[PDB]
Amino acid sequence: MASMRIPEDVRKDIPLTNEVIYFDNTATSLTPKPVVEAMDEYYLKYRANVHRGVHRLSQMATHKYEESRKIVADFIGAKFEEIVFTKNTSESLNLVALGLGHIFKRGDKIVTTPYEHHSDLLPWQRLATKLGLKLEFIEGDDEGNLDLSDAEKKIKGAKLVAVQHVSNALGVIHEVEELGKIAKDEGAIFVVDAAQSAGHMEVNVKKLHADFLAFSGHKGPMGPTGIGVLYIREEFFDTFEPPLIGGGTIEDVSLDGYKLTEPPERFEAGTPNIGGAIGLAAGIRYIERIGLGRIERQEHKLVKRTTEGLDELEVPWYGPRNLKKHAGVVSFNVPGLHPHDVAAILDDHSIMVRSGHHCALPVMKKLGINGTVRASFHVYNSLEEVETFLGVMEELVKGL
């Protein structure tokens, strides 16, 4: 951690904060200058492919790529070899399903939540359709709070359990450690979608009891696009079948066949996103300078003021009322305005928010709504921004 003012010192590294009030962090974060500079350095000063080529540029790129893997492993409490780079969380979750497919038999059971983003639902639906599996959903309420008694009943006899850490639509923070303990007791593989928690709060594989965990660098970690992570706990190394194979994944190859190399390269086919890995390690180091605790504290300030100000204007908001279980995401609706209209009006005031179903249609259907307006934060967002937002909201509500 370093000494700095929050949010001011972070804002100074993000020129866009001078132009807009960016409340669409759940979709993607804004990117600080030092992350762009780290990537630029690769492209202009040490550009090369990895895999320990003899030449000095490849040696440098290889060292920085390995450094970056180790940075990511330490960020989530994993070992170097348990970190695989992918393009995004969605790729990572697809690879889990694809790579474990062979272990299932007709009738086996998979359990998830009813609030999953499509990327943590479709792959399991496909697998369940292909193999004749049972796909069950833990009961929960309209705020996103899961029924843990029901979770114990459902996870019992489950082959695999997949859950999101944080809902991208509702902002609910699930009791992932509790669910992971339940899964471990029952002998179920435990897969965590951490796309909305990484970089916003602590994410640790050992604490969560994760067997597989996915996250996206472009979200909370303040990294670039095109870089995702898939954590594979070591005990699955020889069980997980790499879905993508080719250059970089082998030890030997003849016309007649092949032999794969060891993790993590075993799972990384072709030239990785070397620039993106370097940028994501820069973003994790930038997050570490600020500190996760300061980030979580700042975001709770924002959520508390926002949700109190919407209460004053009688604007309904979704998700947990208990703010200790509410991440930096506030979904809401203005009675008698479609959420795209609210979004458009806010855009006119240079406030960026998202509208619609948020790739979580089953949440919208469970709630009986077509979508929501969503304001989401990061540590560079300020209470002054929130006040400006609430002023615009007030005028909108007073206008009718």
Ligand X SMILES: *[C@H](N[C@@H](C)C(=O)O)c1c(COP(=O)(O)O)cnc(C)c1O
338 labeled part of a ligand binding site: no
Which residue in the set 76, 78, 84, 121 belongs to the binding site for its own copies (CB under 8 A)? Answer: 121
**Amino acid, single-letter form, for residue 278:** I
Q: By CB under 6 A, is residue 24 in contact with ligand PLP?
A: no
Q: Which is nearer to its own copies, 252 or 314 (CB)?
A: 252
**Amino acid, single-letter form, for residue 120:** D
Which residue in the set 107, 157, 187, 270 belongs to the binding site for ligand PLP (CB under 6 A)? Answer: 270
* Cβ pair 269, 242 in contact under 8 A: yes
The DSSP-derived string for 13-66 is T-GGGGT-EE-BTTT-----HHHHHHHHHHHHHS----S--SSHHHHHHHHHHH
* Secondary structure class of 372 (helix, strand, coil): strand
For the chain, how big is the Rg over CA atoms in Å? 22
Task: Compute the least distance from the CB of residue 170 to its own copies, in Å.
Answer: 16
271 labeled part of a ligand binding site: yes
**Amino acid, single-letter form, for residue 35:** V
Q: By CB under 8 A, is residue 388 in contact with its own copies?
A: no
Q: Among 131, 337, 359, 383, which one carries the catalytic annotation?
A: 359
Distance CA 157, CA 187 (A): 8
Q: Which is nearer to ligand PLP, 168 or 333 (CB)?
A: 168
Q: By CB under 8 A, is residue 354 in contact with its own copies?
A: yes
**Interface pattern 226-245 for its own copies (x via CB under 8 A):** xxx--------------xxx
Which residue in the set 216, 273, 306, 331 belongs to the binding site for ligand X (CB under 6 A)? Answer: 216
Interface region with ligand X, contact rule CB under 6 A, candidates 64-72, 84-92, 97-105, 140-148:
84-92
| 359 given a catalytic annotation | yes
Task: Compute the least distance from the CB of residue 189 to ligand X, in Å.
Answer: 18
CA-based torsion, 315, 320, 326, 329: positive or negative: negative
The strand pairing partners of 213, in sequence order, are 192, 231
Q: By CB under 8 A, is residue 261 in contact with its own copies?
A: no
Q: Which is nearer to its own copies, 31 or 209 (CB)?
A: 31
- For the packed helices 383-399 and 339-348, what is the interaxial angle rounded to 10 degrees? 120
Question: Could you give phi then psi for residue 333, rounded to 5 degrees?
Answer: -145, 145
Distance of alpha carbon 206 from the chain centroid: 18
* Secondary structure class of 230 (helix, strand, coil): strand
92 labeled part of a ligand binding site: no
CA neighbours closer than 13 Å in the CB half-sphere of residue 267: 28
The strand pairing partners of 162, in sequence order, are 191
Interface region with ligand X, contact rule CB under 6 A, candidates 95-103, 137-145, 191-199, 284-292:
191-199
Q: Could you tell me which residues are annotated as the binding site?
A: 90, 117, 196, 216, 218, 271
Q: Active-site residues: which are they?
A: 359
Q: Could you tell me which residues are annotated as the binding site for pyridoxal 5'-phosphate?
A: 90, 117, 196, 216, 218, 271
> Residues in the site for ligand PLP, rule: CB under 6 A?
26, 88-90, 117, 119-120, 164, 168, 193, 195-196, 216, 247, 270-271
